[PDB]
Symmetry: D2
Subunit: 330 residues, 4 copies
């Protein structure tokens, strides 16, 4: 099995942890964070979105004992002191959101780890990979990024559409679920004034680099897509609204056929397909990073269409982080 | 003053009433609904969205007495039995949502009213008029429709963009505020399954004819626009997300210049313009039916752009209903 | 196995169904509602609160096929026409909320059923039974009621406190989750004006008979308890706030000791006990009808205390409906 | 007029500012905060709860110009450097929530101010005052506190009830609106684990010292009251739920009479009275710190009753802060 260490036991670190429990190829052996082992156990045990942890969690001697397995807990603010080698860590899931560059993440390799997977878009030229889009381009680099949740949703769909009909250009809008960075009531958000306004009372316009980032995982689409976001008061599921101009004329039925074929073929487990009258909550706990909603989309004509795809911002992304870890471990 | 009668004291009927109080040329003299005066007074007095009524409302002899003025309250299920003439009603604001056809609405004329304005889109060929779009095309018709709130937002913006740069094709998405048609919890909705899902926990994909309806008030745009909606857990303000392909190249700055010019000139009071970091709640109580958000929009290139415009589904629309009434009575 | 038939496939009927799937002794063989099989299948398959159905649901010949088992679907507005005998129904879970009287409910007996359990409080003198409170008093009655969700939470707790310290008088408040009876936006509610106000933006004071209803299942407490409710913008979990005056002095520690003893003994499975820092969502899916929150309560002195107990309005109640069914069929 | 300087332009500082615009006796001449004048102008201009500021706000030379009046803006992290004397400040409204003791608040007097009013409960023995309860006990001290919003709601009601029937003992529960200290999604809250859970999805039990604090403003009630709180997903209005044991027997009608008399007499403007079917939103913008809801309350008997009172956590409190400032200025 692959031994993983999680740096940063936040929303993502915890979902990566919970998802890993259902996997036999990956095993989390250590967790690092500036929180008390007792507090971490509580946040693992109870979750307003994902429900109670299905298993046993006890704190003994400052460490966590999850389902019997002892998990080393530390509180190092500096990655270089993590001593991952003492616990035999192969890959480190970097989830603090603070070390998104090579020289910072590299510290884990200095601390004993062999490879690092950033659970967010790298801030430098560190390569990003998205399952269904470019895992095959992986060339053995020791530090890698899993891009973002929106890019993970957009990339697979954009690939199927482009491969079959050719995307001339497209604009995306993601109706985004409330994040941890937003506020409960009108408060300060210096770099993002709109973002500081009460999340529960508002539809908040926001900018996103997720659409442009698709160009990095799918070079052939570089410069052909961009978009924005609207932050809404929902808890977990977001939706991508992609308006595209096709090179090859295609009826909506042909578009549905192409997506469905991919969902049951080369992108099974990545891209999902549905024709049901679904709503956001129906995807809470969804592992597919992109679920094509056939009935929600609409076409003006054979070359201008609006496609809709759902994604659980935490569950889908987190499972793919594990997929990348497995992939880079050969 | 134009003496108006309101049929259907629901959400729209009530806001039309509150709005009319601030107009010296329009005067509400009668209301008809299947609710007792006491309950109607209560619903006028208190509103979770618009706040308390700015004035006095009392019940005497089963009739409302608002700000000292007596208002005849009736409970006729049949418009034909309304006797509008008895109280001198000139125009009837038809807001029950039940008589959106000439046949049904004409009963008000039989009952003594001179003209009728439907506060919703016509089901038959009754002409629809949208301020800033086609009020100039009015030709003496005694029964007219004010279209829907979404159409009132899209039409003015679409006209400005088309007149200046020419819209080849467009696809819209309205992130819609929760409607009274929605369920608080997963309940039966045979007409629209998704619509019966809990409104509070979901982002609900929905269909809309507002985009296509633009082709009716702006024939030159017939067949060039269509779209859908996403209903979200917010109270009053919605936003249109318009993705358009332009005939004539235009930089985003030039597009902004054009919109601002219209807002300050020809479409003053209908189309608004802002460059502030606004969010939905900033438009609660907004009179303009469409407020261009300069900083929220984004352009892929000089011919493919995404525009954003806000609108209070109740305040804007209701003020325009009053405008149409004044317009057809000139 | 006890063969059960469900009349009314609404919220309660559906959860009773999901819950029954996990019971080897109870078996649902028929459902009756005025909805088509297709729609019912959809409502069973997807739920915004409870998630997707854990199993397979298919429609064949207008009948449901859940987990391979065929379930007879009918659409009778009249219980008398149900023919329960044809499918061998032993007990009928009456969940339409329309037949809460012996006269009306007895029609199921005429239709071939042996016994009937109302999933709501009786309107007449049909006896009500609450697990942990008076199941032992059952005396062969063929038509019984399971009371309401709030009563199921209050009764067990009230009994433990009374049996040990003696309740002289008590006043309760249930901070209630939003019900399907509520409006998403300010709409008509002649029966309860406050109840027609927008559920999403308000804290709505409401009346409840659950506290007084305790006097019926626990006669010794008749006339000693009453209370009210506050409906809030949350989905499933409610909480009772019970302020009581004790006959025998008791420290909060002694009260905790007593409650814990009952939860681990006589009331195991009905009354739960916790000392964790829980919040409402931690009880979504909770089977216990009352979960004592040890750290939330507070005592003024040894004779005046405020107790707090949580309850999932749907999961707890529905599991007990099944318990009553099994109990009256023993 | 009294010249006031505000230290801390947060939620409270801003509402105190906006309320002061409607007062001719008080004039804000300076504001201090670690935010940019441009950012402060934006937060003053737009508010999701209170709507847009009714007036003009422009930033010139690093200062704010509100309705023409120039307001000195500074960004001193240390009160002693505020130089209040240069702007002629009489009283300082201390709203940062950081200087709740004599020695810290005293710095303003060192900086040139004459008196200080803490907009929160003092952490030391600094005297607290609540309008309607003990303003008359004010003995000319230079540093004073306005207690908290819940105490401001509870104190006046408790006084009327105690004065007329005598409170033997009582327990309170405040259904509290979402505060700035809560989180949007499950995050860290080291001193309050429950408080770190998602506010939008939960009913969160919480402890409060507001009930006990009543003993400080009303010594005669010292030790007779205590309580707790439930944090719910509403934006602005909270409600006090007081269960009391009366010394003198009183029917609910006699209780309503006593409260109404006080509301129209000695506590006019402080204590409000209503018999309408109101809900939380009906009190958004309420200046009365306590509004007795006659129809929501319930009595078990003539000596044990449950009273309900509403309060806008920001508007009511803020207006009383201004009242205290006026009061201490003779
Ligand atoms: N939340 C999502 O939906 C989502 C989706 C895709 C990518 N991401 C990315 O995941 C990253 C983390 O996001 P999150 O929501 O989990 O954040 P979070 O704030 O919930 O968690 C961050 C965690 O890191 C810990 N930490 C902080 N400083 C540390 C330090 N100096 N050393 C060690 N540990 C430390 C914190 O204690 C906290 O527990 C970000 O890059 C974010 O962009 C998030
Ligand atoms: N609410 C919005 O945001 C919005 C926006 C654009 C257009 N509209 C339109 O407004 C119209 C009404 O919608 P609403 O949201 O105000 O609904 P509503 O149900 O609140 O109002 C309908 C009112 O008519 C009354 N009524 C019913 N039958 C009647 C009868 N037979 N005679 C007299 N009165 C009767 C009802 O009691 C109710 O008060 C619809 O055509 C709708 O499409 C609404
Ligand atoms: N939901 C809760 O939290 C809760 C808690 C305790 C008790 N209850 C009780 O459950 C009962 C039902 O409430 P609900 O919330 O499930 O409501 P609901 O409206 O969702 O369910 C009623 C169902 O009965 C169906 N129906 C209507 N008429 C019918 C008929 N004539 N014949 C057959 N089927 C018919 C409806 O289609 C609907 O599906 C009530 O007595 C209620 O008090 C509910
Ligand atoms: N919010 C309520 O409903 C309410 C009710 C009653 C009492 N209070 C009390 O009011 C106080 C402030 O609460 P709030 O909600 O306004 O807080 P907030 O966080 O919204 O505002 C605090 C403000 O003080 C400013 N500030 C911070 N540090 C400063 C410093 N070092 N020097 C100068 N200025 C500084 C911050 O920039 C911020 O603008 C607290 O004691 C709170 O308990 C609040």
């Amino acid at each position: 099995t692959i031994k993983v260490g999680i740096n940063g036991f936040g929303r993502i670190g915890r979902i990566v942890f919970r998802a890993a429990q259902k996997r036999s190829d990956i095993e989390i052996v250590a967790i690092n964070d500036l929180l008390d082992a007792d507090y971490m156990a509580y946040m693992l045990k109870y979750d307003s979105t994902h429900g109670r942890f299905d298993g046993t969690v006890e704190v003994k001697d400052g460490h966590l004992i999850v389902n019997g397995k002892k998990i080393r807990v530390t509180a190092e603010r500096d990655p270089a002191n993590l001593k991952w080698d003492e616990v035999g860590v192969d890959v480190v899931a970097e989830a603090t959101g603070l070390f998104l560059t090579d020289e910072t993440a590299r510290k884990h390799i200095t601390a004993g780890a062999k490879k690092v997977v950033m659970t967010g878009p790298s801030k430098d030229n560190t390569p990003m990979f998205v399952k269904g889009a470019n895992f095959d381009k992986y060339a053995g680099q020791d530090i890698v990024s899993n891009a973002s949740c929106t890019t993970n949703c957009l990339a697979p769909l954009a690939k199927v559409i482009n491969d079959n009909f050719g995307i001339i250009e497209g604009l995306m809008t993601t109706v985004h679920a409330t994040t941890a960075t937003q506020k409960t009531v009108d408060g300060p958000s210096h770099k993002d004034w709109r973002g500081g306004r009460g999340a529960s009372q508002n539809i908040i316009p926001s900018s996103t680099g997720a659409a442009k980032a698709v160009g990095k995982v799918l070079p052939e689409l570089n410069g052909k897509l961009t978009g924005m976001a609207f932050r809404v008061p929902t808890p977990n599921v977001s939706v991508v609204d992609l308006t595209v101009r096709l090179e090859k004329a295609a009826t909506y039925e042909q578009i549905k056929a192409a997506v469905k074929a991919a969902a049951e073929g080369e992108m099974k487990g990545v891209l999902g397909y549905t024709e049901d009258d679904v709503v956001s909550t129906d995807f809470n706990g969804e592992v597919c990073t992109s679920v094509f909603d056939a009935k929600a989309g609409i076409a003006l004509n054979d070359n201008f269409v609006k496609l809709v795809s759902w994604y659980d911002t935490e569950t889908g992304y987190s499972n793919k982080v594990l997929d990348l870890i497995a992939h880079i471990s050969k």
